[PDB]
Every structure is written in C-alpha cells, then in structure tokens.
Nucleic acid binder design. Sequence first.
DNA 1: CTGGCCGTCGCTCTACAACGTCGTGACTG
DNA 2: CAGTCACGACGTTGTAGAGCGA
Lengths: 266, 1085
Amino acid sequence: GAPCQVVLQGAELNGILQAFAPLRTSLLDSLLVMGDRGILIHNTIFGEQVFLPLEHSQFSRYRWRGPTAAFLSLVDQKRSLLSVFRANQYPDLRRVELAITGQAPFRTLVQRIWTTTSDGEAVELASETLMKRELTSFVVLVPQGTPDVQLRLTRPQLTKVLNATGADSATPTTFELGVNGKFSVFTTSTCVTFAARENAKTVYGENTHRTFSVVVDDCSMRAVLRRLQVGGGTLKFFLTTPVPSLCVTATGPNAVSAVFLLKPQK
Amino acid sequence: TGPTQRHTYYSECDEFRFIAPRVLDEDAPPEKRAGVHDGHLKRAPKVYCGGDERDVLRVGSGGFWPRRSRLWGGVDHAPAGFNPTVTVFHVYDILENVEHAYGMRAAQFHARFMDAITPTGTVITLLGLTPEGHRVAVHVYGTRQYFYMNKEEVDRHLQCRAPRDLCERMAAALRESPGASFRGISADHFEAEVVERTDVYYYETRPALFYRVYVRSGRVLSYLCDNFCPAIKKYEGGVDATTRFILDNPGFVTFGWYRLKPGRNNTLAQPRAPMAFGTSSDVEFNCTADNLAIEGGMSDLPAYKLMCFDIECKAGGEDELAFPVAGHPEDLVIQISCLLYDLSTTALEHVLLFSLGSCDLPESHLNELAARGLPTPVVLEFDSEFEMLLAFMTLVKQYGPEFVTGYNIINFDWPFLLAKLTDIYKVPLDGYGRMNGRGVFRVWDIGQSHFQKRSKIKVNGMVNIDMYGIITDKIKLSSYKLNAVAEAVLKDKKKDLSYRDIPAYYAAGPAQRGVIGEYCIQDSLLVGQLFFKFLPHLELSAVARLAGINITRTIYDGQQIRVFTCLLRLADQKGFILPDTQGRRHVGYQGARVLDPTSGFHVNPVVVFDFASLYPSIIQAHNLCFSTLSLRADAVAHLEAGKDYLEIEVGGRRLFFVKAHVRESLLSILLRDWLAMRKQIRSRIPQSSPEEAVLLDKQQAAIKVVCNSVYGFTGVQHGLLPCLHVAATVTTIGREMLLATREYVHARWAAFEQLLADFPEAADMRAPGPYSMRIIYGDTDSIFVLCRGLTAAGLTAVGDKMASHISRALFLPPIKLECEKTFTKLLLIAKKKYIGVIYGGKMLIKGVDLVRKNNCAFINRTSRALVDLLFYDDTVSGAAAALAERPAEEWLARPLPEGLQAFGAVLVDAHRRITDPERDIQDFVLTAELSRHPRAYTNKRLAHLTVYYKLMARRAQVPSIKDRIPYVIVAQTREVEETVARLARKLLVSELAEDPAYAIAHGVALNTDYYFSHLLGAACVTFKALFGNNAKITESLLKRFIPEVWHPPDDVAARLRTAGFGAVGAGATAEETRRMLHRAFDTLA
DNA sequence: CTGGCCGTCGCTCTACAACGTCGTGACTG
DNA sequence: CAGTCACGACGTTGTAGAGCGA
Ligand SMILES: [Mg+2]
Ligand SMILES: [Mg+2]
C-alpha cells in the first residue's frame, strides 16, 4: 500500500464533480496544497485571491503522513491535476485516485483514472495518469481568524450586488452597513440596499449588528465573481485589520471563495 | 644616364603633408593639446633613433634598419667589384610583365631577347635567392600565350584563306576598338598555325583542325577572347603566360631550385647591367627557358626573410573613443611593430618599432626579451605620420622580405596603411613591391562581390600570409581574437590593450607610449610563434609545386585553378584542348545518401566501415571523365555493353562511360599518379630525419588536398571546365555502393553460424544474448553496424576482415572499404549527429551543439558534463539503457529510473549557477559569422546583424565579412523595450542582442530566461534519442529535474501581510504551516 | 603609351521569425 | 439559449548558421 492515499469514487466522485461543474476551467492553473485536513486549491484572478478548500470529509478514503505538501496544478505546462473535474471532458468517470511517494523534502504525487466500459468493470485510462513533484520552497498566504461580519445572498441578490458596483477604477464603489441593518453598496450611481437579519431585499447573516463603511477602487469584482459563476453566496468581511478585506464565498461544499482587498480608510 | 625604366618609389622627398598629434608638444598649454597639426612642410623626412637623426631616404654607411638592396634610385650601392656567379637559385615567385623593345633600347640586351619583345613581348620574371643569399631576378624571354579556334568554324565565319588572313582579321578587330588602346597593333603581333586537336568533352568528339594563335600580350589575348568572334568557341584563352611557361617546359616548378645552363646553340644567360634592373634584386639575368633546368636533389629552403608586422592606430576626431577610420586624416597610425625573421632557421633577427612621437620601452619588457635571447628592439621615432609610413614602406622596399605575415593584416593592418598612403598622402605604391615601378600592390575586400570567397592582397614579389586566415582554417574557436588564439594554441594567457585605452596612454608622455610599444611587440611575437608552429609557407609551397601555380595564387585563387592546371598539363600531352566558357538554382545535382538512423543509445558494439577516398576511387574505378562520357547511345554502338562501357542512369538520363581499355580517363590518370606519389612519400616518412619528415608530411598533405578537390571541380556550375554529368555520376554510384554494402551485410551475416563460416576468429567473440548484425546508420561513405552478441574486444580485427571481404565481393579494385573504429557506446541522435566512445576509450562528438562554434561556454560545459555522465558513469549508463524498455510516453507517468538522478543533479547545478549575480559574462557570449555583406541578407532580423549595426552606430570597430561577431542576450528591461521602439512586450532574440564589451561596461544584465531555456534546449536536442527521439517528452522529463519555486510578488505579499494573512511553507516551522491550514480551511468555509 | 572582375560539392539539423489558424471565453438579445 | 469579436498558443514555411561527408 502507498504511504499516502486519496480516493474519489461513486457518489463521492459524483459530489466532487457536482462541486466542480460550475468552476468552468478558471481554477485549472493553481497551487494545490495537501494535509490531514484535506486538499486546498489557490489561484489569483485579476490580482485578487481565490481558493477552493476540500475537507477530508469529501473523500471516500484518505490519509496524511508527512508535512504539508504543495504542488502546481499544471503538469508540464499543458495538462493539469484538475483537468479530471472539468466534467464534460470525462463524462465516463468511475474512480480517481491520488497517491504520494518519496521522502518529505522531495515528494511526488501520482493521479490515476478509471472509467465506464459499457459496464462497471472500471477499465483504467492508463495513458491519462499524471505525475507532479512537490514545490521545494513555496510560500503562500492564506485566510486566518474569523470573518467579523457575514451576510448571505441568493443568486438574484448577489448578481444585483455585482450590478451595484461600478465596472472599473474610474467608477469606485463603497460597501456599507447602516444602523438597524441597512446593508448597502453604491458608486455615486448604482445605489442599492438590503435589510439585514442576524422579502426580495432581505439579507441574513452573523454579526450584522455593527455599522461600517469600506471603499474599493479595484475593478475586479465584476469580473472575478462572474467568472467563478457564483450562485447563492456569502459575504464574509475581515473588517478589523489595518487593511480590511472581503471573502466572498459561494454555497455548498463547492465553497469556492475569493478575497478582495479594500481601501484602508482608517 | 638613369635607369632604363623609371623607379616610382620615393628615393628622395623634400615636401610632405605633416600630420601629428598636438599632444606631442610638451611645452604647449592644454588649450592647444587636442587634435592634429595638418600642413605642408618643406623638409626631407627625418627619423630619430637613440638620440641620432637621419634622413628616412638616405642610403649610406649608417642606417637604423637593415637593407638587402643594391640600387637606390639610380645609384649602385654594391661594393666595387661585386659580381657574384650564379649557378643555382631558388625561385619562390613568378611575375609576368610586358616589355617593349623600344623601351629597352638603351639596355644592352643581346639580340635574342630584343627579338622576343620586338614589337612587344611577355617576360616571365623568376624571383629568388642564391644559396649565398643574393636576391635574384631571372627574366625569361620567349614565352607566348596562345588560344585555339576551330579552323572550319573561323574559315566559315571570316572567310580566311590562310593563317596570315586570320592574323590580319585579329589586328583589324583590335584597331577598330573602343578606348583605341591597341594603337599600332599589327598582323605581325600574331602568329597562327594549324594543328590537330580534340575537344576534351565526350568520347565521340572527333579530332579536328584548329588554328593555334600565339599572342604576345595578356591584354590582347583577354580582349580577343571577349570581343573577337563571340560565336566561335575558344580554347585555353584563359591560360596565363606563367602557366604556359611552366607547362611548356618539362619538370619546371613555380617553387623550387633551378640552375642556369647552356641553351640551344650554347647560348648563355646574360647578366643585366645594374641600370637595366627591373627589380630590387642583387643580380638579374636575361635568358630563355632552355637556359634553365630544375636542380633536383637540392632540397632546403634558402635564407628568405619573413616580416611579421602589426600597426596600431589612434583616433583624432572630437570623439577619441570612436574607432579610427583611415580616410579621416586625423585618425593616425601611431606605431608599427615590425619583426624580421629568417625562414630557413626560424631565427628572429630584428625587432623594429616605428613610433609617432617619442617612445621609451619599459625595462621589464627589454629584460624579458633579453632573457628569451631575442634581439634588442630598435625604436624609430617620427614627428609625423607620413615620415613614419614612408619609413616603413622604405624598409619594405629596401629590406624586401619575401614573406609577410601578421594577424588580420588583410582586413585591417594593410588596408589602413594603403588608405593613408594613397588617399591622405598621394604616394604611388606600384614601386614598393619587388619591381621598381608598375607592379601590383593591391587589396581586394569582399565588398558586394557575390562570388568572392575571401579578402585578398597581391604585392608583386611579396608573399602575404595572414595568420588569421590560417588559424580559422585549422582550429575551431568561437572567437579568433589574437589573445584567445594564444590561449588556445600556444597555451599563453596574454594581456591585450583595448583600443579605448590607447588615447590615454598616448597623451601620457613617452613611457606610456612605450607601454603601447610593449603590447605591439608582444602581439607580433605571438604571431611569429603561430607562424612557426603551423609553417604555412611549407604547406602552401607544397601545394604550389604540385599544382604548377605560383604561391600567391595558391593562397588567394581557390581550388579550381589547382585541378585545372594539372588537368591542363595532362590534356596537352594527350592532344586535348580545354574550352573556355563565355561570360560569368540551389543545387545542380543530387548528392549523397544519408540513411535514416536507428535513433537511440546503443550499448552493444558498433563497427564503422568507411570507404577510403570514396569519390576519388569511384572516378578511378569507373573511368569517369569528360573525355570518356557519352550522352548519345549512338556513340558506343561499336562497343560491347558491360565490358566496354558502363551504362548508368543519372539525374533521370542515360549516360555512357567507356572503360579504361577503350580510353583512359584524364581525371583517373591524375588521381592514380597522385595517389601513387602519396603512398611513395608516406613509405619514406619513417626512415627520415625529423627535419626532412616535416617536409614530407607537408608534401603528402598537399597531395591529399588536391586529390580531394577533383570531384568538386567537376560539380561547379559555371566553373572552369564543369561537368555535372561526371559530378552527378560520382554521387549516383556512391549512393548505389552504400546501399549495396547494406544489402550484402544484412544477407550474408544474418546468422552467427554464417559469420563463423567466414571468420573462425569470431568463435571466441560471442557475447551473451541474441546475435544480430544490422546497419543502424550510414552517411556518404560510412556505414555503422550494430553487432549484438559479439564482444567489442575482438570486433576491430574481425571487422577489418569483413571490410576486406565486402570489398572484394562488391567493388572494383581501387575501391576499398575499411574498418576505422568500433564504438562501445553510441548515442545516435539524428542524421549527421552522434556522440560515441571508441573502443580505446576516446569520446567522439559529431554534429551536436557541444562542437558547434555558435553556442556559449556555459551551455557547452554543462552539455559536456551531461554527456560525460551518460558515457562515463556506470550508474547513469545503465539507467539510460533502461529508459529504452518502455514507450517514451509511459515515462511521463512513472518515476524516472534511480540512476538518472546524477544527470538531474547537473541540470540543477547549472540552473543555480546561471542566476549567480557574480557570474562571468564571457561564459554567456554567443557568436555568429557574417556570411555575407549585411545588405545581401534577406532576413534582416538577426542577432549578429543587430549587433553589427549597433557597433557601427557606436563607431566601434565594425566586423569584416567572415568575422565572428560576439554577442550576449540582455535582460528585457523597460529601458531596452524603449530603445527598440526608439529605433522607429516579448522582444525577439535579435532585439535583446548586444556587444559583450558594451554589456560589461554599462552593467547590462543577461537574459537568464534565454540562457537557461537554451541550456534545456541543447540538453533536450541531444537526449531526445533516450526517449523515443521525441522532443516534447524529453523537454518535459528534463524540466521535471529543476526545483520549481512559487511565491507571490513582493508588493502583494506585503499587502496581504498587513491584512493579517498567515503563512504556509518556508519562513515558518512545519507545525506552524499545519496550524495555519487548520485556520484557513475553516475561514474559507 | 597601359586595365579587370570572380571562381569545390550537396545534405542536414536547428533556431528564429513570420504567417495563418485553432480552441477558448465572456458575451447579447 | 448561439452568433461573435477577440485572444495566446500552436504548426508551418523560409532563411540562416554551421556542420558532415566527399
Ligand atoms: Mg592587429
Ligand atoms: Mg572515409
């Protein structure tokens, strides 16, 4: 048996695929990092940070012996370790495995694939098997602590927030919450509001109680959150820090998320 | 009184253009120390030496430089009663000049000679030494050039009744001529006679009557051949008088010992009176060719002098860092180093330094010279450029070195001098060679001339050998700067003064000028050493002797004229005449087969069979010639197919060549006689003295070079005597032989039993595993045979036996297949590209990047390390053998074998070193040759042309055509991206190319992405063959060895840190990275 | 009573640069 | 939900360098 083992099969592989289907080849270039807690995918889109965590709970079987490991998704700058989950590229899947080998400073991941064969006998797609070495000296910065305020939007609501921001640095936008739960965003033009709770314009969340204002010259939101194809999703503010930032998450275990750096207006 | 013919060199001078740096005026205020004085001055030119002073042009009891001259202007300076007897003399050079009886009125020539130049005539001057060291000129009278025209054709065209009619027609045609140059030419300037000859082309060509027409002058002959009757074919009109002299007299040579002797009616060579001398000789004679004989048995070179010289220049314009231009009056020659050697002993005799301004050589340099037993440098000082150049040209005239060498003298040192002497000053050069006037003294650069192979210099009696030309033809170097060549060939590291250092050293007083002096002398001594290592004069004279052309033409005039002249000698004694082509597309015919290689790394023994002198042997074996070919089948109907002629299809046409017993091929006769001669010479090299052995070695090499050229001669479209039927037949037969060898080997020794049936000695060569013997490669005349199941140890001999067996099986007796070598390992990469190790142990590298001049030292060293691993490490050798067990695509999906870890280690180390900020930029210098003039390029966007125009913009030294231009590829900074659009994203290599001197000086960074990509490229190209010959798979697998690193841009990292993001990876203990993930996943949620 | 040029062959790989096309990719009514 | 303007990468040709073999 391999020293480290990961398996997706059946509904679990049906799950991960169900999770990945909306990603739309955005994440395929990425850092992939691995531990006992699961798999984490990381990439920058238009400069802003993007992540997809996958907890060990989503895997049919798992292991993790050795330090954290880190890979780049792109294999030989052409194929990728995530290509498997671009669901229309392989409608035929039945199992996928990851295994790791080599000692802790210089490991290698191997990825293996099996498919339907007019029957469930799971023939191996041997030619498609992938190998990728560990990054020797990677450094990646990741979220920490807890969001200070959370707000929960449906697909209509979140898209209308994207409508409510201006499109570029020539059209800066301010996100706000006013006292007694008046969430808002505006861009001189394109002013909108949602009524917070701890029907169309109501928003649910946590720590909704605190009033604040943050402004954004960054163009990114109109592009990033569209091309991760967000459905329903949460705003998760990190408002407290000298520079605040906003994690906008999706919904379901496809919790693909992007963190937007804001103006440090005191 | 006065010389019969006027001397045109300066024997006296009292007004000249004085040009001199103002910085030499030590008492002048600095307001007045810039630039040059330039004005005419009414003094005789002076030279200063050791506190003494002399007129440059006075010949007398003193003298600051040696002389080997008798006359000066009209004065005879030989001691009274000087009248040496000449019996034997060595000839090194031959001139041909036209004399006129009327001009020779008052020279007291005997009637024999006057007759020969009566209207006018061509005189062959043999230039030479006596064994006592006197300079000799022997003027030979009575050699006429001639050409032929078919009698029937010219009788039809001109209605000639007689040979005298033809002469009348020819004189008339020259009289009514543009330019009116043939004034008073007469029918009696011509003789015509009727002879029977055959045109050399085709076996069917019947003998016919021709008028042979004698002409007294080359000018006449060349005009008649261009203009007389263009419709009527001419034969041998291109042959010069020297050639006629050499061929019309049996055994005569263009380089070698002669004797004077009684001629036809006991006639004797007449000594010329000194006033009738044509040249700066000590003694001169008039004679006819029957007064001459080869002095056989006399061997050794006489005491000829070699001058090795080097000029240095200084710019004078406002920009003193601009490279000097020659045509600019103020860009002066400031020093001329001049070393005089005796060729017979190799001894340095004189060291002469010419300097504009005072010049005190450093004592350290004088002591080094004194230690080495070298003559103390005489330093000659001049107040102006003119006086220095005049003095140098005077030394050249008065000392008259028969040989002149230097380094890049043809491209730089000579042109710069001649430009000054002819453009700035108006000195006629035509008296400054051996003749006293009217001689050639000329440089030809390549220029726009599409044809011209090299730059040339002709000085009428002075053999110029440029060591830059010699070295680039005998050593393969990325750079041919003198100090690189010194390091490579002589094994001396030597400092080399930059042109940009010269101005400061010049203006820093006499001692600093002395330092420039030291450098100039050291340069010239290196060049001396190179010359005496390679002994280029011995090679060249050997070829000159063999080919029957003069030494000068041997050096500058190509390969064709060598075969042409030998073929002419043989055609003559057979009754053939050679026709001249009138006037002045990729390939003319199909060449050699190269088999498709079984590409891979072969660890079983590989034997190489190769045909010795394939194309020469084919020409002999199949009796191939102009004169043996027929296109018409009609031409051979009286002969029997098979036994009288070869019928062969060539270029999609049926050719016939008759066999040797019908008619023997002229080309075959040449090659047979030469190869006999070569075998004879090599049979004596063992039982010879070390001094004699050097000469014999030079002789046999000359023969090899000339034999090898015969095939090419036939293949030249628009050459002297082309025949593309012969050239194409040679390669056709060669193609058939290579395939025949393959078919035979495959059939005959498919099974080990069959090999043992031929070679009992194979019985104890059998190695473990299955026997097979298959041809894996072959190119032109070599074939490579992979011999599974046999041991390398015995293979050499058994293969020599097999080669000899295949020979007598398949091929006619001059043809000989030989077993050259066995490889124990062979990386057969591609056609014309392989790396392997010979059974003795030696690595042979062919075709690949490691042995190409263009690529930089860094990439080459790394490549050589990877190759030395694959071949000379056991572990890696086995791993590379083990890759071959599987299809190449599978290696993308399995761990690469354990042994190839070391090969990985080398790439990792190279990656690490390439990005070292304390790298030496010389390791990154790429180079390419200017093949042609920059405006003869179609694709203008090339790295070396980019650097070429940058150098010219910067007024740096512009490279000559055929020079290798060094460059580095610089980092694409925004400043660079500017300069480019400032010449009207990712930029091409060409745009990021730069002169390495500039790159050093301005601290320009190298393009590491380029150089590392190019390393991985060189690796990938070479080791494709380990991985199914697939470049994409190999690039992938090699790239997997490098330690990849990912971290965000520093600005982003900083900003994220200010927003409370935690770290994973480096910069933290592993447990902190674990901790941080457990926060991350739950905050991403 | 003044003028001339020049003058081995073909095969082959590889890099480089220019040219055209291809699959992707967010997109609007 | 599909006709669509646009973009980075790929394959292909020609040139050029430079060697291979006579
Ligand atoms: Mg020099
Ligand atoms: Mg050979």
